[PDB]
């Protein structure tokens, strides 16, 4: 991250070994479960591009996925270079990605007036690449999810919303899915109870009713 | 590392026992997997030469590899002495390596105006020696990697890019490898699908297609 030094100037704070080891543990154990993106985003709060790159280089495994992430940063940084032509100097996509930008340039922009938040901009590109990885590591679309004939409705809801979280679909599609597929793919008894609640029932009401099956 | 003291002067910060124990764990468990170089580089952020030397001395095992690293620092520091003849004083290769330089000389140069970053310079030589170790600890060249007859394409990609990371070849060779060998060494069905995509397909497209086999 960045901090004020005791000399009264903005200076880099290096990543703690506990933060790097946490990120290793996260990526090793959770293997791009969707929770890895908020976990990454928490571990990389205030990160400069060099800090982000040090996290990504440390992963070691999953190199096919890390290449899909590099393909994403390629096209996102090219899109930045397209949307922001060249005239501190303004950062190019390779500056935001931390390749052509020194650490001191990164801190310079992140503390400019107004700031250019190259750490956050690059972190958006990484998070978007992790999103593509997370879909392709999901085994099932939400359309595949159906309640087991004796599966508790709370466990089916947990499967459904955990899948819906990985989906992709635009937000109004996720509204239609949580209204419609959640009912449509229940077991016949719970399905009948849900339809008896009417279409506007909240998840709390739906669970409270179908717990009785 | 280096910090501002409460007296208002630049002063050494000693390595934490958690950083040294982390480096021991890393080198003991990961045995110069290519990830050890970014992991080393993160653990040694802002390190003086004395700090780097304390990390390397602490390794204990792998002494044949640590000798290959000393052979590398020998030739790199000799090349520095060749490229930078003698006229604070300017550092010799033995000063940057932290042998003939006190800690106070190291901090002096690392806080000079302009600075001479003897910590970073020496860390480049160490990282280059670790690169030579990492190749020789790799069992296979990328040319040896072929997809198993029923191996999932995502697992073959992971083997391929993990090997390509250790390679060595210059960057345009790695471009040619990821375009050509990645297709050429797939299983016959996935290989046929990949050729049906055309030569410019991205890794995301390639995986998305060959997942169907």
């Amino acid at each position: 991250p960045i901090v004020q030094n005791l000399q009264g100037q903005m200076v880099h704070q290096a990543i703690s070994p506990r933060t790097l080891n946490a990120w290793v543990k996260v990526v090793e154990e959770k293997a791009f479960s969707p929770e890895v993106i908020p976990m990454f985003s928490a571990l990389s709060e205030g990160a400069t591009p060099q800090d982000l790159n040090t996290m990504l280089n440390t992963v070691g495994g999953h190199q096919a996925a890390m290449q899909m992430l590099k393909e994403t940063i390629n096209e996102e940084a090219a899109e930045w270079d397209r949307l922001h032509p060249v005239h501190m100097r303004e950062p190019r996509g390779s500056d935001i990605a931390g390749t052509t930008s020194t650490l001191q340039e990164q801190i310079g922009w992140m503390t400019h007036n107004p700031p250019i938040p190259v750490g956050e901009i690059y972190k958006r590109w990484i998070i978007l690449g992790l999103n593509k990885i997370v879909r392709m590591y999901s085994p099932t679309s939400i359309l595949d999810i159906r309640q087991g004939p004796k599966e508790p409705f709370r466990d089916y809801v947990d499967r459904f919303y955990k899948t819906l979280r990985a989906e992709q679909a635009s937000q109004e599609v996720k509204n239609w899915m949580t209204e419609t597929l959640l009912v449509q793919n229940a077991n016949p008894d719970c399905k009948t109870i849900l339809k008896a609640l009417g279409p506007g029932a909240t998840l709390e009401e739906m669970m409270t009713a179908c717990q009785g099956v | 590392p280096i910090v501002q003291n409460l007296q208002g002067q630049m002063v050494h910060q000693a390595i934490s026992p958690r950083t040294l124990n982390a480096w021991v764990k890393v080198v003991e468990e990961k045995a110069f997997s290519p990830e050890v170089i970014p992991m080393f580089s993160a653990l040694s952020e802002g390190a003086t030469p004395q700090d780097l030397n304390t990390m390397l001395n602490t390794v204990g095992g792998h002494q044949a590899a640590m000798q290959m690293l000393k052979e590398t620092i020998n030739e790199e520091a000799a090349e520095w002495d060749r490229l930078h003849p003698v006229h604070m004083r300017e550092p010799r290769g033995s000063d940057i390596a932290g042998t003939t330089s006190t800690l106070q000389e190291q901090i002096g140069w690392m806080t000079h105006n302009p600075p001479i970053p003897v910590g970073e310079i020496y860390k480049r030589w160490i990282i280059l020696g670790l690169n030579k170790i990492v190749r020789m600890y790799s069992p296979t060249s990328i040319l040896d990697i072929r997809q198993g007859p029923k191996e999932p394409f995502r697992d073959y990609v992971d083997r391929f890019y993990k090997t390509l990371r250790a390679e060595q070849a210059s960057q345009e060779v790695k471009n040619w490898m990821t375009e050509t060998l990645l297709v050429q060494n797939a299983n016959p069905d996935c290989k046929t699908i990949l050729k049906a995509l055309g030569p410019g397909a991205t890794l995301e497209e390639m995986m998305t297609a060959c997942q169907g086999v």
């Binding site: 591009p49 060099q50 390779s94 052509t100 | -």
Partner: peptide, 14 residues
């Protein structure tokens, strides 16, 4: 491109 296939992240070009 900004990051090439075999390279680490944050690798300076050339």
């Amino acid at each position: 491109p900004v990051l090439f296939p075999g390279q680490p992240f944050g690798q300076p070009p050339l």
